[PDB]
Amino acid sequence: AAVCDICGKGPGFGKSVSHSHRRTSRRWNPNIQPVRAVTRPGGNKQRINACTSCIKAGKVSRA
Amino acid sequence: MKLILTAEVEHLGAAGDTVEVKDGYGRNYLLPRGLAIVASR
RNA sequence: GUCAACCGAGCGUUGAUCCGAGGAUGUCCGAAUGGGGAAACCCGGCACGAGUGAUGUCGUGUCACCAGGCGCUGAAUAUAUAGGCGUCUGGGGGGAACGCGGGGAAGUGAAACAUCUCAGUACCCGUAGGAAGAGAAAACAAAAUGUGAUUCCGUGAGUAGUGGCGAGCGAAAGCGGAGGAUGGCUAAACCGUAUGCAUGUGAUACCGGGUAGGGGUUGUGUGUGCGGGGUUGUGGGACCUAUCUU
RNA sequence: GAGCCCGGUACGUGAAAACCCGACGUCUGUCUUGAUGGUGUUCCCGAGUAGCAGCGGGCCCGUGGAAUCUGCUGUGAAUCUG
RNA sequence: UUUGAAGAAUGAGCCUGCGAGUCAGGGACAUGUCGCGAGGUUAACCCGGGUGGGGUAGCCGCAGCGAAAGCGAGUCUGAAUAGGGCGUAUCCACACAAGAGUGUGUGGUGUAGUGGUGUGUUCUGGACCCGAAGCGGAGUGAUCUACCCAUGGCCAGGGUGAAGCGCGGGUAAGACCGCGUGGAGGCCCGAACCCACUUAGGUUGAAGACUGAGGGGAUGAGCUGUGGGUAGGGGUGAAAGGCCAA
RNA sequence: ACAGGCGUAGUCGAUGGACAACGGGUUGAUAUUCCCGUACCCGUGUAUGUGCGUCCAUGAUGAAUCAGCGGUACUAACCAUCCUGCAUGGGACCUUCGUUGGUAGUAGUCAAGCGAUGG
RNA sequence: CCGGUGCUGGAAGGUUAAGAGGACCCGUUAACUCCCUUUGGGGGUGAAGCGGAGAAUUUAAGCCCCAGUAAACGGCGGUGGUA
RNA sequence: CUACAACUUGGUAUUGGUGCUCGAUACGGUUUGUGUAGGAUAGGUGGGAGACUGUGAAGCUCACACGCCAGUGUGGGUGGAGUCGUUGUUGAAAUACCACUCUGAUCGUAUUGGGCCUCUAACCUCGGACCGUAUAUCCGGUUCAGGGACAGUGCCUGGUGGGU
RNA sequence: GUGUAAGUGCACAAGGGAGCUUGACUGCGAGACGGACAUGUCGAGCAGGGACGAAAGUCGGGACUAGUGAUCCGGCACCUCU
Structure with a gap:
């Protein structure tokens, strides 16, 4: 959900600021997607968690 | 993304396009x- | 040994008791790890020994899990992989303070209180090392023909600032010191080589030229590895191309 | 209530063994198939990165005209007249 | 503590011990004292077995006015020598002006700060000492009690007499009606058992919730044993703000 | 995010299931435990005797060949319906399936006894 | 009793976020144009680029809006005369 | 009062294909241009004195459009040797040719969004069957059957919100 | 009667009428009143440039005393500031 199985990208932590400037803790999660990758041209498909940046970088081989 | 075609694909082009x-x-x-x-x- | 004596037995000049270093033994529990368990107590497998007329019994080794190498096999299923089997090397837990990276209060102050403060504190999580972290300018600086990695100490300074411009918070440049390693190695362009995957005018093609062969140092690509070569700011380096040559 | 009584003190001395610091060696790596200062051009100089946008963190700086640094989400360059 | 308490406002059984304005910081202000004096002084650090020596970076005085550019014994405002504001240590003498309060000049006189340390206040620190109800973080508890889950146990004795079935009457057949059998039920009376309605006692109790007389339920939505589960803004609750180790 | 939450295979967990002993005596203190008398339950070894089986044999059996004939129906055909052709239904050819004379209860499998981690 | 507040159903309109959109304007300056003086500053215009603020336009639910609903929460009257 | 949980709206990423259906501008463009001086609904500036023609012009009949039905255009048919000019009008010429276009309905090339019907390959399935597996209602894989670019999830955003 | 409460004033008018006008100014301001402080109040006179008046002169809003809101933060205009 929050950790990429490829690059180790993890959630950041910050504050949520209201108009009255009340600061409350919140999280910034990565865009983690479940992708069936093809590690080898043999064709084995395994369900892995990859961020959308990893998909963009072609790092997850969804063949 | 940029790529060329290997086989015939309809509405796209011929081989090598x-x-x-x-x-x-x-x-x-x-x-x-x-x-x-x-x-x- | 002592409380802590009272005995009873004995050792010591052939060197005791005693002090230092190195070894041996080291029940059971505990990360606890053969399996189980209410910690310190229950029940085993295998191998080799002991014992018994034989079963019973005893002794010594070894038998957790996970991670990473190596080797064998390769499900559905075809390529194969997941998995399985064997074998090696690690890990696990503890510890007062100090370190680094994350998460993160409230009492309190503001004479109320929400922004703010308390405070990135208390506490928590993950990790070390004898220290850690940082570190070799994509830096400062201000026209000085200036400094020259990082860290720490003193000033600058409770200043410039910042703030329901409230309570409060609060630098850096510069300068003086500690210590000095103004330290090293890489990636790429190019070469050579090896290999995987594609193919191949499959010949006039790739060595440095001149001569003569030859149809592959592959012929062409592309990927990867390995070895060279290249570590730079006035830019540097490959590619060239002269000159000089320990 | 001790310098001259005792343990000591100033001052000297002492290690079989283990360990720790040095030093000199075997040992290992490495340069010598080498070096210099010169001339005009193509190629290379770290990419999902820098930059930009949205939402945050932290800097004297409480979002402010807000630079430098940084997290997540989108978009996304150039190799030195960069 | 009070306007006021000998006390009928507060506190103190007694003795002996113990128990409340302290420390840090080149902090801030004032005032003593010492050194130096238009200067005073070092910080970090370095070297001395010390309390000693060095160390000029800084800091405070030495010129002010103005938002600032800036000017400077002046400066700001202003069109203004035209007045005011701030500044030129202070005093003295001499003049010239004015009697709207005194001023403007010329000579003299010459200006005092700073660093230790004592004391009194003060800032930031728990800040003279003692004293809450409560608020946060991390843990510990369902051996009491609330509910649930699994598996066992217990409920003397006596009554009442449902459905069903049978026989007989009755009918075309039934409905129905008697007599039997039967043994139902959050049924009845009542011990064990579980409760807790009244009263008396107890009330520095035998007992931090009991005792004696009576009282309710007592085959069920019963009681009880053993083992287990739910955890704090959470649980559980036939619901009382009940219970979650007096 | 981490810390951790669940949970499969497993493995624990009685308050339950299975499982063979009774009466008498004795000590200052234990007794279905010791002793006496009489039992029952698991194992182990030795000896003896019946009486099965492998080797031996006998039974029990049954599988497969060729070849002899009828119905599916490679496909060409016939009948009939439907719209030259058409699809359907039906008889049969080839292969194929099915019956039976030789074969091959001979090679084959089984017949002591244990028996599941499975039903 | 559906007026109020809920709930259910429906959008024909009004309003409305982010995101898309980037007119217009502003800063900077290559270039020019005026000076005004002499040992180069002082005025205007100003392309492109890079920036800064950014408008018209488009856009959902919600709300407003239209109905229903009371074993929904709720509500269920006064004054004068007359045999 | 101020926040937040939870729920919900849209955008965007994950996230793709083909077709229909709408809207903007670009390009080859048709097209629309009624003072009056008049052969007369002059768009001006142009190169602007000769062009189209037979890749069949004047004169007529049809279709459509608008229609200020003034009449113009295109398309076809008919006919077969013309309209035209500084023609004289005028800021402004010819509607004789050529070189972008301005007030406007259109087309074919682009781009760009909006909506719709679909498709499968992303993604999803607590649907089936196999395998890991001796034991497995775990999990993973393979495969079939379905959904399907929706959903879920990340980032941004508006609502409801005593639930805290 | 004096715009408006009440009071102190005003017939010398401050009450009624007419003509011109913008002093409902700019730079200031000796001296004072009142006051915890912050506020508040009066003010002659000087300069500039004006109004009215022949002139002397008067005019820094209104017979007087109410008609008001500190600081912070932000907006607008101008400046020979940065």
Whole structure:
């Protein structure tokens, strides 16, 4: 959900600021997607968690 | 993404045609079945 | 040994008791790890020994899990992989303070209180090392023909600032010191080589030229590895191309 | 209530063994198939990165005209007249 | 503590011990004292077995006015020598002006700060000492009690007499009616058992919730044993703000 | 995010299931435990005797060949319906399936006894 | 009793976020144009680029809006005369 | 009062294909241009004295459009040797040719969004069957059957919100 | 009667009428009143440039005393500031 199985990208932590400037803790999660990758041209498909940046970088081989 | 065609694909072009495609199309249809490969050299 | 004596037995000049270093033994529990368990107590497998007329019994080794190498096999299923089997090397837990990276209060102050403060504190999580972290300019500086990695100490300074411009918070440049290693190695362009995957005018093609062969140092690509070569700011380096040559 | 009584003190001395610091060696790596200062051009100089946008963190700086640094999400360059 | 308490406002059984304005910081202000004096002084650090020596970076005085550029014994405002504001240590003498309060000049006189340390206040620190109800973080508890889950146990004795079935009457057949059998039920009376309605006692109790007389339920939505589960803004609750180790 | 939450295979967990002993005596203190008398339950070894089986043999059996004939129906055909052709239904050819004379209860499998981690 | 507040159903309109959009304007300056003086500053215009603020336009639910609903929460009257 | 949980709206990423259906501008463009001086609904500036023609012009009949039905255009048919000019009008010429276009309905090339019907390959399935597996209602894989670019999830955003 | 409460004033008018006008100014301000402080109040006179008046002169809003809101933060205009 929050950790990429490829690059180790993890959630950041910050504050949520209201108009009255009340600061409350919140999280910034990565865009983690479940992708069936093809590690080898043999064709084995395994369900892995990859961020959308990893998909963009072609790092997850969804063949 | 930029790529050329390996086989005949309808509404796209002939073999070797350099066509511009959306990343979803190239990643999920063309490349996995070998109807195209990326453009390097 | 002592409380802590009272005996009873004995050792010591052939060197005791005693002090230092190195070894041996080291029940059971405990990360606890053969399996189980209410910690310190229950029940085993295998191998080799002991014992018995034989079963019973005893002794010594070894038998957790996970991670990473190596080797064998390769499901559905075809390529194969997941998995399985064997074998090696690690890990696990503890510890007062100090370190680094994350998460993160409230009492309190603001004479109320929400922004703010308390405070990145208390506490928690993950990790070390004898220290850690940082570190070799994509830096400062201000026209000085200036400094020259990082860290720490004193000033600058409770200043410039910042703030329901409230309560409060609060630098850096510069300068003086500690210590000095103004330290090293890479990636790329190019060469050579090896290999995986594609093919191949499959010949006039790739060695540095001149001569003569030959149809592959592959012929062409591309990927990867390995070895060279290249570590730079006035830019540097490959590619060239002269000159000089320990 | 001790310098001259005792343990000591100033001052000297002492290690079989183990360990720790040095030093000199075997040992290992490495340069010598080498070096210099010169001339005009193509190629290379770290990419999902820098930059930009949205939402945050932290800097004297409480979002402010807000630079430098940084997290997540989108978009996304150039190799030195960069 | 009070306007006021000998006390009928507060506190103190007694003795002996113990128990409340302290420390840090080149902090801030004032005032003693010492050194130096238009200067005073070092910080970090370095070297001395010390309390000693060095160390000029800084800091405070030495010129002010103005938002600032800036000017400077002046400066700001202003069109203004035209007045005011701030500044030129202070005093003295001499003039010239004015009697709207005194001023403007010329000579003399010459200006005092700073660093230790004592004391009194003060800032930031728990800040003279003692004293809450409560608020946060991390843990510990369902051996009491609330509910649930699994598996066992217990409920003397006596009554009442449902459905069903049978026989007989009755009918075309039934409905129905008697007599039997039967043994139902959050049924009845009542011990064990579980409760807790009244009263008396107890009330520095035998007992931090009991005792004696009576009282309710007592085959069920019963009681009880053993083992287990739910955890704090959470649980559980036939619901009382009940219970979650007096 | 981490810390951790669940949970499969397993493995624990009685308050339950299975499982063979009774009466008498004795000590200052234990007794279905010791002793006496009489039992029952698991194992182990030795000896003896019946009486099965492998080797031996006998039974029990049954599988497969060729070849002899009828119905599916490679496909061409006939009948009939439907719209030259058409699809359907039906008889049969080839292969194939099915019956039976030789074969091959001979090679084959089984017949002591244990028996599941499975039903 | 559906007026109020809920709830259910429906959008024909009004309003409305982010995101898309980037007119217009502003800063900077290549270039010019005026000076005004002499040992180069002082005025205007100003392309492109890079920036800064950014408008018209488009856009959902919600709300407003239209109905229903009371074993929904709720509500269920006064004054004068007359045999 | 101020926040937040939870729920919900849209955008965007994950996220793709083909077709229909709408809207903007670009390009080859048709097209629309009624003072009056008049052969007369002059768009001006142009190169602007001769052009179209037979890749069949004047004169007529049809279709459509608008229609200020003034009449113009295109398309076809008919006919077969013309309209035209500084023609004289005028800021402004010819509607004789050529070189972008301005007030406007259109087309074919682009781009760009909006909506719709679909498709499968992303993604999803607590649907089936196999395998890991001796034991497995775990999990993973393979495969079939379905959904399907929706959903879920990340980032941004508006609502409801004593639930805290 | 004096715009408006009440009071102190005003017939010398401050009450009624007419003509011109913008002093409902700019730079200031000796001296004072009142006051915890912050506020508040009066003010002659000087300069500039004006109004009215022949002139002397008067005019820094209104017979007087109410008609008001500190600081912070932000907006607008101008400046030979940065």
